[PDB]
């Protein structure tokens, strides 16, 4: 019952209700740098709550060391302690992760948990 470790429904609650008081437990599915320019790199995450995945997660620049020193990597399980939602002009929403704790390393989790499906925004 590995999906029981994840906050199933947190993604829908964030995107539909604007709920930002929750501290959801999510799994990183993928991380990649996004094209920036001459400034700190930015990192985009495909995250899963066990039910849905969402590719619109952005890491605050102050958390870049977690990715660059490899504690925050694909498959790891983390709990979001502070995040904000920003809505673009075209209506799509960005979840910016400001504070998070890696609960279990990627090496200890090992695999994608469950079969989450892409969230329909």
């Amino acid at each position: 019952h590995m999906v029981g470790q994840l906050s199933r429904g947190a993604i829908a609650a964030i995107m539909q209700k604007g709920d930002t008081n929750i501290k959801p437990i999510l799994q990183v599915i993928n991380i990649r740098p996004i094209t920036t320019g001459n400034s700190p790199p930015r990192y985009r995450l495909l995250m899963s709550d066990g039910l849905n995945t969402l590719s619109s997660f952005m890491l605050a620049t102050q958390l870049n060391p977690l990715v660059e020193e490899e504690q925050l990597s694909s498959n790891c399980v983390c709990q979001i302690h502070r995040f904000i939602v920003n809505t673009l002009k075209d209506g799509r929403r960005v979840v910016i992760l400001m504070e998070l704790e890696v609960l279990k390393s990627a090496e200890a989790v090992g695999v994608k948990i469950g079969n989450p499906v892409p969230y329909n925004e």
């Binding site: 996004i34 952005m58 673009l88 002009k89 799509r92 960005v94 969230y119 925004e121």
Partner: peptide, 12 residues
Amino acid sequence: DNGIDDAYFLEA
């Protein structure tokens, strides 16, 4: 949910 491109993503 058509995925947001990087070009419009640090748009804030």
